[PDB]
Design an enzyme around this catalytic site. Structure first.
Site, PDB file in Angstrom:
ATOM      1  N   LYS D 156       6.968   8.332 -12.535  1.00 18.24           N
ATOM      2  CA  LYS D 156       6.389   7.195 -13.241  1.00 18.24           C
ATOM      3  C   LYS D 156       5.490   6.371 -12.319  1.00 18.24           C
ATOM      4  CE  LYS D 156       9.145   5.120 -16.071  1.00 18.24           C
ATOM      5  NZ  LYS D 156      10.275   4.510 -16.826  1.00 18.24           N
ATOM      6  N   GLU D 182      13.478  -6.118 -13.610  1.00 15.78           N
ATOM      7  CA  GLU D 182      13.441  -5.070 -12.599  1.00 15.78           C
ATOM      8  C   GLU D 182      14.493  -5.351 -11.532  1.00 15.78           C
ATOM      9  OE1 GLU D 182       9.604  -4.601 -10.807  1.00 15.78           O
ATOM     10  OE2 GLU D 182       9.773  -2.408 -10.832  1.00 15.78           O
ATOM     11  N   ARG D 183      15.224  -4.314 -11.128  1.00 12.82           N
ATOM     12  CA  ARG D 183      16.141  -4.466 -10.008  1.00 12.82           C
ATOM     13  C   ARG D 183      15.361  -4.840  -8.754  1.00 12.82           C
ATOM     14  NH1 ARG D 183      17.043   0.227 -12.857  1.00 12.82           N
ATOM     15  NH2 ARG D 183      19.193   0.674 -13.476  1.00 12.82           N
TER      16      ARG D 183
HETATM   17  N1  LIG Z   1       2.238  14.229  -7.742  1.00 12.96           N
HETATM   18  C1  LIG Z   1       3.376  14.486  -7.056  1.00 12.96           C
HETATM   19  N2  LIG Z   1       3.340  15.170  -5.891  1.00 12.96           N
HETATM   20  C2  LIG Z   1       4.447  15.438  -5.184  1.00 12.96           C
HETATM   21  N3  LIG Z   1       5.676  15.056  -5.565  1.00 12.96           N
HETATM   22  C3  LIG Z   1       5.860  14.354  -6.712  1.00 12.96           C
HETATM   23  C4  LIG Z   1       4.696  14.031  -7.548  1.00 12.96           C
HETATM   24  N4  LIG Z   1       5.161  13.350  -8.612  1.00 12.96           N
HETATM   25  C5  LIG Z   1       6.512  13.258  -8.466  1.00 12.96           C
HETATM   26  N5  LIG Z   1       6.931  13.886  -7.354  1.00 12.96           N
HETATM   27  C6  LIG Z   1       8.327  13.962  -6.866  1.00 12.96           C
HETATM   28  O1  LIG Z   1       9.283  13.419  -7.782  1.00 12.96           O
HETATM   29  C7  LIG Z   1      10.294  12.702  -7.061  1.00 12.96           C
HETATM   30  C8  LIG Z   1      10.396  11.291  -7.617  1.00 12.96           C
HETATM   31  O2  LIG Z   1       9.120  10.654  -7.587  1.00 12.96           O
HETATM   32  P1  LIG Z   1       9.040   9.078  -7.867  1.00 12.96           P
HETATM   33  O3  LIG Z   1       7.615   8.620  -7.678  1.00 12.96           O
HETATM   34  O4  LIG Z   1      10.141   8.415  -7.079  1.00 12.96           O
HETATM   35  O5  LIG Z   1       9.450   9.090  -9.423  1.00 12.96           O
HETATM   36  P2  LIG Z   1       9.615   7.763 -10.307  1.00 12.96           P
HETATM   37  O6  LIG Z   1       8.336   6.996 -10.115  1.00 12.96           O
HETATM   38  O7  LIG Z   1       9.829   8.294 -11.702  1.00 12.96           O
HETATM   39  O8  LIG Z   1      10.826   7.080  -9.726  1.00 12.96           O
HETATM   40  C9  LIG Z   1       9.851  12.704  -5.604  1.00 12.96           C
HETATM   41  O9  LIG Z   1      10.554  13.716  -4.886  1.00 12.96           O
HETATM   42  C10 LIG Z   1       8.379  13.051  -5.672  1.00 12.96           C
HETATM   43  O10 LIG Z   1       7.972  13.759  -4.500  1.00 12.96           O
END
Ligand SMILES: Nc1ncnc2c1ncn2[C@@H]1O[C@H](COP(=O)(O)OP(=O)(O)O)[C@@H](O)[C@H]1O
Ligand SMILES: Nc1ncnc2c1ncn2[C@@H]1O[C@H](COP(=O)(O)OP(=O)(O)OP(=O)(O)O)[C@@H](O)[C@H]1O
Ligand SMILES: [Mg+2]
Lengths: 56, 86, 458, 460, 115
Positions: D156, D182-183
């Site tokens: 997200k 938000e937390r």
């Molecule tokens: N475009 C991307 N490239 C590499 N890894 C990604 C990508 N999108 C999501 N991930 C992987 O998904 C996991 C969670 O991503 P995160 O940004 O924390 O998700 P959210 O925003 O839903 O919490 C991470 O391990 C991240 O590396």
């Protein structure tokens, strides 16, 4: 030979029957969930009406 | 004694209560609806012969009396969970 | 002599001198601009205050208007002069004909006939519809109720009953339009006048656009007229367009009267309001009233307190269902819930009872097989469970029937089926003697003859 | 000079008595000194006798009966404009970061009227996000509302940062982020992940942390909205992110319950649809600029019939669904092409070429899912030549839906790519109609444009 | 009997109607109603009763209590609150009894902290 062919035909027929059964079971889940959710919402509405109309 | 539609009694006591502005309860029934049916049905008893002799001042000796009750209740599509049926 | 002191919606409060306060259900009168308004007394509050329901538009009322105390209830024209005419809740003519030449007027608030005055009859009154007569026979002088949700046919069924019953009935009839469409009443009136049967029907209209007081008291007015024709010693047919609206009008008024809500927001006095009306629409040793009442059920909920308490007040109850109407099957009667007090071996004979119970047993078994049919399909049924399903489907289709009032929809000619024909047909289907026809042959055919004939046409 | 006095303190609800000729208006803001801190009260109801009932924007502990209440003749006012970019603020427009006092060229009231009819744009433009899946399968109307139906753990925030970056660089827009409910932990590391990715200078942050009283959380959304309105009035096209719209609904429910109004529907406030309409009708395209919004949605009990989803769905234009399963494939972003939709996909607004291309890829992917079930039960031997062609093109399409972000360079190491809509249309057109069948599927994965796909293939 | 130093058995034939009498009373005491129509004080009243029923360093009370579960729900506040206080739990089930087997104890919901 006839017996073995009828056995293979049995396996294929059971395959298609179980396909149909699985689809019908999913299609029944999607109706039971509407019944359940409508009952959930109605129960909340009725209990809270009793509480608010109960005070004072 | 065959009480018929004791439920159609409970509706009546509810009408009296809500017209008298007492605090309502579950399904808007009065709180003391259990006490109504409880003190009606507990009159159905078998009484020992000593009670019958004490009551009739000795005119009837050695016989027990009895009152048997058969209440009738109506369920909304069979839901035992309702307040009066429970 | 009195003054308006509060105005809440359709409810009006009036103050009177302490020595002059009105009785309950007396009629008051107000000038509302160039209109005349009637108020009916509901409650006496403390201090000469009296609380009323406006029998007309509440718009335009100020505080401080003078109210006149008419020292009698709402009273309506009554008797042979009220026949062939359309009237207001207040007994006023609403057709454009002249005055009603009534010799007598009766107050709409009356006591019910005594238990000593009642009467009972076993006489079967045949109705053309096949399903109603076989499953739920209705006797003359009794009460019949048509239960159904929105748009399931409880008005149209009553028009077929009006047609078929009027064949063998000679006396007068009363029709009470309570909180329903104006168009249905207008269409009815012109059908009656174009067939010259209007000379025998008296009509009261309180339709759904009118304010709550009119819709509440219009029902009582119609009962007043039906009771006159009963008390003359005649036999009378009383049709009520929708009894549900009568309880709902009380709901609409109830909270404004200062009363705590009960159950699902209903008025606490619901059971008594329904009973006090239902107990005076009854037969007596001098004459008999036969009545058909449409009973709307909200949100298709047959457990709702208003339909639930209506069930107890009827002899024959026909329960319509949307699931059956959606399958094309009309009239959409549910045979597993429709019932009558008259379906007894002594009343209808052992054949009439055995056929009905066989039909119910077969259909009930059809229901229990539907879950395994739903999950696994029909090929996993037992070899005679398949036969039960086939006969149940044929029975379901043969319950359907073309109506003379449905030609405007189906286009098919209508059918009348006598008793000595429908029980023969169903007994034969149950015994399997007509099992060889296909399912479609039984849809919308009058008699077994027409089914086999239709099967010849595939 | 202060002129009101507190009469009651019951939880977050505080009652105040003013002189009869001076009773403050609804949504006016008032200030009291609660110990050695000022506390802001928001007027909710004007009761009889000159008494107004208020809600405390902060802890109501330590208030005495009989304190002096000072009447600000305006609603709560917040700073607006360029000076707020890169800063973090609370409900009141006060800085919660430690970078100090804000420039404050102008201060604006959060409670504002909505755009009127003759001000609305007499056109129906699209926004070019630059992300292949979104611009192809779920295009955004400029000034529309978009719903993000995904749980945390699937990307997200990286999607949000990519949109912030692209709208700042490839257009001239700014973004506003409103962290409703938000937390605190997340707020902290979302702040870190934006500052370590150079997008922080192009976004404004307002956080309503959950430990705040219900009044705070509810008005946090309006604060972000008014900052977006300032950027619109400057003539820009603006993105407003709402971190959860469900939390706004629930804050409204809690406040309505505290004030004692009768509940509605499934226990929600009676004003539910009005409050949603007050929020959503301000987010539109005007004749000077526009605010587009991307809103995270949580569906209670997984029930799409519940009044909060049912009311929210009345306002959404597009709908983006994120999939755990797609993410497991290594495909990023993890958008689901079959459940994500937009009511901009019609020939009448988007054109026949784009419509037929989107419909085509949808048909291919759906048929591929059915064929993949057939493969699961009976192997590849059942497929005809037509079926094998469909499966191959479906795999090439699925690979081609992946994209390297300028924000994702930290992981992939590949340079980020912004793909124009025409390039996306051409790529899926070609793959659907059998061109590029002669080069392998891994040439399409994570590459960018279709020209870049073929140039990847030449030495793959 | 406990404070005299003895070991005693206390048999209580249904705890539910203690709470139910409390509900009937609560309605007219002017207490504002609570969930499922129960009194606000339900847990407090139950706790004030159950905590007295213990074994101390001077003597022991051993307690056997029947509790009515309305409609076999086992989930409404009165059965829910009473579960916390007990050492041994035996949950009779209508379903087992209906099939004709006595005692109707459900082994999948019944247990003791002595096991
Ligand atoms: N475009 C991307 N490239 C590499 N890894 C990604 C990508 N999108 C999501 N991930 C992987 O998904 C996991 C969670 O991503 P995160 O940004 O924390 O998700 P959210 O925003 O839903 O919490 C991470 O391990 C991240 O590396
Ligand atoms: N025998 C029939 N054959 C075909 N359609 C029928 C039949 N009976 C009723 N219907 C259908 O039902 C429709 C409505 O009829 P009707 O007015 O009796 O329904 P209702 O349940 O009483 O509705 P409402 O309460 O709105 O007046 C008809 O217009 C027609 O479509
Ligand atoms: Mg009708």
């Amino acid at each position: 030979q006839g017996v073995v062919e009828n056995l293979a035909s049995e396996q294929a027929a059971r395959m298609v029957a179980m396909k149909a059964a699985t689809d019908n079971g999913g299609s029944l889940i999607k109706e039971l969930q509407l019944v359940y959710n409508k009952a959930r919402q109605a129960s909340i509405t009725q209990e809270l009406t009793e509480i608010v109309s109960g005070a004072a | 004694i065959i009480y018929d539609d004791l439920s159609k009694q409970a509706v009546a006591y509810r009408q009296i209560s809500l017209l008298l502005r007492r605090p309502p309860g579950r399904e808007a029934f009065p709180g003391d609806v259990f006490y109504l049916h409880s003190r009606l049905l507990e009159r159905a008893a078998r009484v020992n012969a000593e009670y019958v002799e004490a009551f009739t001042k000795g005119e009837v000796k050695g016989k027990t009396g009895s009152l048997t009750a058969l209440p009738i209740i109506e369920t909304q599509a069979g839901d035992v969970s309702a307040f009066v049926p429970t | 002599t009195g003054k308006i002191v509060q105005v809440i919606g359709a409810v009006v409060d009036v103050e009177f001198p302490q020595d002059a306060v009105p009785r309950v259900y007396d009629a008051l009168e107000v000038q509302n601009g160039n209109e005349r308004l009637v108020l009916e007394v509901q409650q006496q509050l403390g201090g000469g205050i009296v609380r009323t329901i406006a029998m007309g538009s509440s718009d335009g009322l100020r505080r401080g208007l003078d109210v006149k105390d008419l020292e009698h209830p709402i009273e309506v024209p009554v008797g042979k002069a009220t026949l062939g005419r359309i009237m207001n809740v207040l007994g006023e003519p609403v057709d454009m004909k002249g005055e009603i030449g009534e010799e007598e007027r009766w107050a709409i608030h009356r006591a019910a006939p005594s238990y000593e005055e009642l009467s009972n009859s076993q006489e079967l009154l045949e109705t053309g519809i096949k399903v109603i007569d076989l499953m739920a026979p209705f006797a003359k002088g009794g009460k019949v109720g048509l239960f159904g949700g929105a748009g399931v046919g409880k008005t149209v069924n009553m028009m077929e009953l009006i047609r078929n019953i009027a064949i063998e009935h000679s006396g007068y009839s009363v029709f009470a339009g309570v909180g329903e469409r104006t168009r249905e009443g207008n269409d009815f009136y012109h059908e009656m006048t174009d067939s010259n049967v209007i000379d025998k029907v008296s009509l009261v209209y309180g339709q759904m656009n009118e304010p709550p007081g009119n819709r509440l008291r219009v029902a009582l007015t119609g009962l007043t007229m039906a009771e006159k024709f009963r008390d003359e010693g005649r036999d009378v047919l009383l049709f009520v367009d929708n009894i549900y609206r009568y309880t709902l009008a009380g709901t609409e008024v109830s909270a404004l009267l200062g009363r705590m809500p009960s159950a699902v927001g209903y008025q606490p006095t619901l059971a008594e309001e329904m009973g006090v009306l239902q107990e005076r629409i009854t037969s007596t040793k001098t004459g008999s009233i036969t009545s058909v009442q449409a009973v709307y059920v909200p949100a298709d909920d047959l457990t709702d307190p208003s339909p639930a308490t209506t069930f107890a007040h009827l002899d024959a109850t026909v329960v319509l269902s949307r699931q059956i109407a959606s399958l094309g099957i009309y009239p959409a009667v549910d045979p597993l819930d429709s019932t009558s007090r008259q379906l007894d071996p002594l009343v209808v004979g052992q054949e009439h009872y055995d056929t009905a119970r066989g039909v119910q047993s077969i259909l009930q078994r059809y229901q229990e097989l539907k879950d395994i049919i739903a999950i696994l399909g029909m090929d996993e049924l037992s070899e005679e469970d398949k036969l039960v399903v086939a006969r149940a489907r044929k029975i379901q289709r043969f319950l359907s029937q073309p109506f003379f009032v449905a030609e405007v929809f189906t286009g098919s000619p209508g059918k009348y089926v006598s008793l000595k024909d429908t029980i023969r047909g169903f007994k034969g289907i149950m015994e399997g003697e007509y099992d060889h026809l296909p399912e479609q042959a039984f849809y919308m055919v009058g008699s077994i003859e027409e089914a086999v004939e239709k099967a010849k046409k595939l």
